[PDB]
């Protein structure tokens, strides 16, 4: 079963309609099928072109009075801001009056690559004391990045499989690379130190994690869900193995990014 779970994480998509704030204020759109596990800037040289003609005269994106961050993965952004919203996704395009106060300057392509490898490294740190990624010659890092950028699933996982192995003697990873985003995008994410297995050898379940680090998402009466707990657009069962979750439904940056919605 597992390999298909991985393929269907990798290829999850978001239908998206870019329209211009100045066409809306004055609405011909650009339709695209955004990869859920990529980042805006990575696939917005194209958008820059399409509307570059009309750019007679520094481009950012927005959604219902909310700038969209260049370094959160697309899928997480959708899940967190607009899961219940009707499709296709309506992203406003603004190339004037950049929100420096409420937005990071648009990263280059290399600056994103920086963030991506930096996240992969912060992940292998918590997973294997950095012993796995460090070993890798620079070319392997580049293979990871180019496999993401070019949607080459096979290429990318050829290298990532090593990063999802763990010692025989252990029942999983050291800690789990995870981030939890709550009410809004401007709300900080949550990251903590959690072990895949407890003292008694029991494998930890997502339910255990949310009970520990985020109990406000647990009905204190029946121990079941109080809010929506979304990952890659679905809601797994609170009794799902966190070790397995990390191995199979992390974003390519090896994190379990987890949206929480009331």
């Amino acid at each position: 079963d597992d390999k298909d779970v991985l393929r269907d994480v990798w290829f999850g998509r978001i239908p998206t309609c870019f329209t211009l704030y100045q066409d809306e204020i004055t609405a011909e759109p650009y339709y695209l099928l955004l990869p859920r596990v990529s980042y805006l800037t990575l696939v917005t040289d194209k958008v820059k072109k399409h509307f570059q003609k009309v750019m007679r005269q520094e481009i950012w994106f927005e959604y219902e009075g909310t700038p969209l961050k260049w370094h959160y993965p697309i899928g997480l952004l959708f899940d967190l801001l607009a899961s219940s919203s009707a499709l296709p996704w309506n992203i406003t395009v603004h190339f004037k009056s950049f929100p420096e106060k409420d937005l990071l300057h648009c990263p280059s392509k290399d600056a994103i690559e920086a963030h991506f490898m930096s996240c992969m490294k912060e992940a292998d740190a918590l997973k294997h004391k950095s012993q796995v990624i460090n070993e890798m010659q620079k070319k392997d890092h580049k293979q990871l990045w180019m496999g993401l950028q070019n949607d080459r699933f096979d290429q990318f996982w050829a290298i990532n499989r090593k990063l999802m192995e763990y010692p025989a003697e252990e029942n999983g990873f050291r800690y789990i690379p995870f981030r939890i985003y709550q009410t809004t995008t401007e709300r900080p994410f949550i990251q903590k130190l959690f072990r895949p297995v407890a003292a008694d050898g029991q494998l930890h379940t997502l339910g255990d994690l949310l009970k520990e680090v985020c109990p406000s998402a647990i009905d204190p009466e029946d121990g079941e869900k109080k809010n929506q707990v979304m990952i890659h657009g679905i809601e797994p069962m609170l009794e799902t193995p966190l070790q397995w979750l990390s191995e199979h439904l992390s974003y390519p940056d090896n994190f379990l990014h987890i949206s929480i919605i009331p």
């Binding site: 269907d8 099928l33 797994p236």
Partner: peptide, 20 residues
């Protein structure tokens, strides 16, 4: 849980990709 994850992903794919 595994079957729920796989199937839910199946269905997720179908709504969002199928239609459009």
């Amino acid at each position: 849980w595994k079957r729920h994850i796989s199937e839910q992903l199946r269905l997720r794919d179908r709504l969002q990709r199928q239609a459009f």
